[PDB]
């Protein structure tokens, strides 16, 4: 039986552990954190995530989809909140088949851990990777208190997140050709209780957004009617606009409260613990990191956030990481050797990871807020008339398994076609709809 | 009138002498060598240099550009000689306005000497600087016979080259924070006569390169159709590769001939005096020398090769030295005092000199390996499309350095963004037809601000 060591019992690491173990591999998985299945007297994390068709299909192949979806809330559309105006619901599709699922991160992780152990994987918690000796095929792990221990390895999988220790170790033996692109927005996680969401009639079966230009809030629902809110705001005010809101200006919870009362007036009354949440939860960092290569011969490979950190504005990081886990297990299972498997996995996934990283950056403007309204109106008519040809980019990314690079290329043809059709036209009445449709049939092959 | 003493009537020294003298400064310029304008029975042999936009603009400001260009050969592009295919011409840019000029060193120096004297500078030849007493504000000079003489000075400019005597003297009063980085390649100059270049149809209006990985040849044309071929090759073979070519393995001219016949077959028949040139011309040494400071209060400053020796792989040493002369004259003319001028000149120029020193080291792989690589060819093709679509955002690094006056550090920083963008766009793609050009252009607009 072939041997493998995986670092990081997160989302990609735990899924790939189950896929390899059920195919007869000897799997050992190491995780820095404690086992979340061991109940303690501590609170429990409220982190939520949007699970889309790519992630759901990966779980389906692993035989875990039904168990995960039993604990997920259906989001039928986007609820856009602009002050004074009643919240406006934008459905995703025509029926409940085109939906996004809101899943609690730690509930999903527990299901994945049980799934990996049921398949035969051995999981070791409270052990963080410190360094790797590639020549000697040994690695060094330690607990939170610094006690160190060495382990021999044959194949190493880095599923250890955006600040991957496996990626750092690989830099000693290969040039990963890394390029880090910082993002000016930080993030802060806040909470809405079940009592507060019911009192203010906040729709449970929707994804909520409070656009505000250079800053915004989003909220995802939980099974118990509570919601997890995320604030996206610049860490610092730029030199050109020193008066503009930023985390630096919000000195404490009371400053944060005054900011929410002014800028998010319909949201502030639902955040009962705003002051406490603001001071106790740390401000998160966002970035895009692109690598030239993801592997070292047949010895080590990266996947998920360890290979391609992206900005969270398309809700696709976990979905991409689960898609990566399926592809890595498929290549490893049937290749001539580990070196061939790792090079083939990198060649397949790199162009698709680059495409979603680019589309996620673009999506910030679409979430944070007449010509666009005209193009949207025309696009909707084309989608209704040619459903196998004109498919909005958001739908190709969220509700299909079309490779990310293909969704990006087709979306470009669609945008170009809409741009020329609307150019130097005030409204829809001056546009020949049949001529635009003929151009759709002329430029977009059916899928 | 403000007084200044300059050491070295080279390229930077003679230009700064004209700029200061025409602005009313009392200028005295000291040079170790004899006056090259005095005709003797000796046979003078100097190389041709590549003059680009930075150097040409400096001469333009000085009113000397037309005189220099009348004696220069136009290089409309690069002629790459890769084994297995005929020589291929790569035009320099968008139009024939983006050219490099091949100018004889001695001819340029003579024009600069005439220009400095016309502006009022006094030039004293056959006097080499030996030492400086900074406390006493005196310096010591000598002739070749050894007779020494002292001179008082007020402001001292060190324009005295790679082995600067002013820089050595400054080490007695300040920590220059020097760091010397040796380079493994040596160099040898070889000749192509006007008869041989015409016989073999070698293009006169181009810069020629013969890439060969760890070694290579280059050739620049002269006004008379002769060319100087420079061979860049390791002094010694490394321990890991003892069989690899090196100067140590070429004991005599006959060994050099066999090497050229095997590895540069299209070049060997043009080098009639190969054997003689190899044995009589010494092997040159290459290096990068970096300093943290270039001045001593308001008393002395370095510029050109005296301040920043660099490897010759980007043809920018003279161009950088002439750019330094314009900046030094600008700071000295307008500052509150000499101390403020020298500190401001060093703060402005030191980061730009560090950037061209780094880009010159990087240009060796570009010329010797990348030019013959299909991935570089696909990258160049994609880069050309981006340059057409976004002309104020995507400007190829070679063009920013050679055909513009953008500060070298800015050309390097923007160049890194462009290198990464092209690398990720072409990765896992065989040709241009599978690349989403609009997606690449969006990365350009997001990452590169317009200039
Ligand atoms: C604000 C925000 C919102 C998001 N929303 C969404 C969304 O709606 N939908 C979506 O698809 N994605 C979303 N994402 C992205 C998503 O959270 C990640 O892309 C995903 O968790 C990556 O999965 P992974 O398994 O690669 O890494 P992770 O889930 O981060 O797992 C990495 C694991 O490695 C462990 N580890 C780390 N270092 C070591 C070490 N040295 N030794 C041992 N173990 C180690 C960690 O403890 C962890 O268990 C969001 C991200 C953010 C920040
Ligand atoms: C192989 C090679 C190829 C090159 N090709 C190019 C090219 O194509 N393009 C380009 O831009 N650059 C090129 N360069 C670089 C270029 O030659 C130099 O960077 C340039 O000459 C520096 O100008 P400078 O005025 O600072 O010094 P220099 O031109 O060297 O002048 C220094 C002067 O000081 C005098 N002097 C020295 N010591 C004393 C002393 N003690 N007392 C008095 N006088 C003294 C010298 O005699 C000389 O006249 C090349 C260099 C090499 C080695
Ligand atoms: N004149 C030189 C002397 C020596 C070595 C290079 C040059 C160059 O000018 C190279 C040119 N800048 C290039 O990139 O092709
Ligand atoms: Cl995400
Ligand atoms: Cl040079």
Curated annotation (Swiss-Prot), chain B:
The keyword Nucleotide-binding does not apply. Optimum pH is 8.5. L-kynurenine binds at residues 78, 92, 363, 398. Changing residue 367 to L: Decreases kynurenine 3-monooxygenase activity. The keyword Magnesium does not apply. Changing residue 363 to D: Abolishes kynurenine 3-monooxygenase activity. Keywords: FAD, Flavoprotein, Monooxygenase, NADP, Oxidoreductase, Pyridine nucleotide biosynthesis. InterPro entries: FAD-bd, FAD/NAD-bd_sf, Kynurenine_monooxygenase. One of its GO terms (molecular function) is kynurenine 3-monooxygenase activity. PANTHER family: KYNURENINE 3-MONOOXYGENASE (PTHR46028:SF2). Catalyzes the hydroxylation of L-kynurenine (L-Kyn) to form 3-hydroxy-L-kynurenine (L-3OHKyn). Probably required for the synthesis of quinolinic acid and the siderophore quinolobactin. This is Kynurenine 3-monooxygenase. It comes from Pseudomonas fluorescens. The gene is kmo.
């Amino acid at each position: 039986a072939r041997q493998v060591t995986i670092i990081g019992a997160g989302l990609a690491g735990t899924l790939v552990a189950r896929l390899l173990a059920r195919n007869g591999w000897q799997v050992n998985l190491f995780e820095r954190r404690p086992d979340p299945r061991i109940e303690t007297g501590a609170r429990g994390r409220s982190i939520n995530l949007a699970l889309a068709e790519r992630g759901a299909h990966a779980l389906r192949l692993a035989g875990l989809e039904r168990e995960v979806l039993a604990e997920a809330v259906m989001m039928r559309g986007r609820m856009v909140h602009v002050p004074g105006t009643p919240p406006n619901l934008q459905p995703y599709g025509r029926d409940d088949s085109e939906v996004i699922w809101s899943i609690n991160r730690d509930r999903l992780n527990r299901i994945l851990l049980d799934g990996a152990e049921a398949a035969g994987a051995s999981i070791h918690f409270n052990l963080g990777l410190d360094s790797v000796d590639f020549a000697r095929q040994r690695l060094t792990l330690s607990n939170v208190s610094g006690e160190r221990l060495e382990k021999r390895f044959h194949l190493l999988i880095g599923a250890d997140g955006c600040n991957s220790a496996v990626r750092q170790a690989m830099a000693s033996v290969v040039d990963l050709g890394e390029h880090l692109e910082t993002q000016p927005h930080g993030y802060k996680e806040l909470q809405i209780t079940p009592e507060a969401s019911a009192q203010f009639n906040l729709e449970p079966n929707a994804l909520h957004i409070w656009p505000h230009g250079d800053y915004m809030c989003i909220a995802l629902p939980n099974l118990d009617r509570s919601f997890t809110v995320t604030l996206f705001l610049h860490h610092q005010s730029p030199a050109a606009q020193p008066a503009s809101p930023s985390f630096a200006q919000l000195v404490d919870g009371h400053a944060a409260r005054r900011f929410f009362q002014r800028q998010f007036p319909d949201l502030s009354p639902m955040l009962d613990s705003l002051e406490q949440d603001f001071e106790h939860h740390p401000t998160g960092k966002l970035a895009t990191l692109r690598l030239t290569t993801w592997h070292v011969g047949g010895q080590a490979v990266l996947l998920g956030d360890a290979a391609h950190p992206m900005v969270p504005f398309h809700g696709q990081g976990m979905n991409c990481a689960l898609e990566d886990a399926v592809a890595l297990a498929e290549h490893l299972q049937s290749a001539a050797d580990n070196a061939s498997a790792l090079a083939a996995f990198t060649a397949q996934r790199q162009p698709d990871a680059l495409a979603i990283q680019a589309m996620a950056l673009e999506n910030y403007v679409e979430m944070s807020s007449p010509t666009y309204l005209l193009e949207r109106e025309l696009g909707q008519i084309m989608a209704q008339r040619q459903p196998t040809r004109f498919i909005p980019r958001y739908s190709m990314v969220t509700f299909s398994r079309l490779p990310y690079a293909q969704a990006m290329a087709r979306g470009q043809i669609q945008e170009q076609l809409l741009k020329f059709a609307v150019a130097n036209h005030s409204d829809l009445t001056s546009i020949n709809l049949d001529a635009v449709e003929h151009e759709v049939t002329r430029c977009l092959p059916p899928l």
